[PDB]
Amino acid sequence: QSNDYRVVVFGAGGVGKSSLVLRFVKGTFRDTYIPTIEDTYRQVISCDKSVCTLQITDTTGSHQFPAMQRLSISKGHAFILVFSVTSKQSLEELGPIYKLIVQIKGSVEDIPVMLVGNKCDETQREVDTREAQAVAQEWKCAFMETSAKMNYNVKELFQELLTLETRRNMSLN
Ligand SMILES: Nc1nc2c(ncn2[C@@H]2O[C@H](COP(=O)(O)OP(=O)(O)O)[C@@H](O)[C@H]2O)c(=O)[nH]1
Ligand SMILES: [Mg+2]
């Protein structure tokens, strides 16, 4: 019997969802020319004095058919909501999915939800760190800034996400 812990990665096109997931799971880059289609990646992790598979779903963002978004949330245990610090529009585009997550799971307080400001290697920002912190405070969720490019806070994101789950004791080690 498999005991998968399922993480779904949401966000607008171009924010770095695929780059975050590939940096974490494979230590590699997103090849621009590979076809844009949902994939799920597997990583073995420690869970409850044993092992389980972390399943990470790299969604296609605004291309994802809404019924498929619903199914992804229903199947998911934890959520990573990625925006680019260079795009205020990308942060705004998380509104609908956050709402649907909270509605389907009943409350933000009952599952791990992480707001992620990716591309924090960039100097021309549209969303300040303090602004993103306020969003997360108002949404009652966690927040982290990352650079997939620089491998900055990439392992830390998944570790913190796993630590937020109170029903299992999970670790990357
Ligand atoms: N500067 C910078 N660019 C990034 C970062 N992560 C991804 N990108 C670039 O942003 C573009 C979109 O990345 P991608 O992973 O395909 O985003 P997705 O559409 O959200 O899956 C690509 O050109 C990436 O090289 C980052 O941390 N910093
Ligand atoms: Mg992608």
Swiss-Prot record:
The biological process GO terms on file are: signal transduction
Q: Where is this motif: Effector region?
A: 33-41
Q: Where is the signal peptide?
A: none
PROSITE patterns assigned to the protein according to its UniProt record, in alphabetical order: RAS (PS51421)
Membrane topology listed for this record: Lipid-anchor
GTP-binding as UniProt keyword: yes
Q: Where is it predominantly found?
A: membrane
Keywords of this protein's UniProt record, alphabetized?
Cell membrane, GTP-binding, Lipoprotein, Membrane, Methylation, Nucleotide-binding, Prenylation
Q: Does the keyword Nucleotide-binding apply?
A: yes
Any idea where this protein resides? Answer: Cell membrane
**Tissue specificity of this protein:** Highly expressed in heart and brain.
| Described function | Displays low GTPase activity and exists predominantly in the GTP-bound form.
Kindly provide the name given to this protein in its UniProt entry: GTP-binding protein Di-Ras1
* UniProt source species: Homo sapiens
By which gene is this protein encoded? DIRAS1
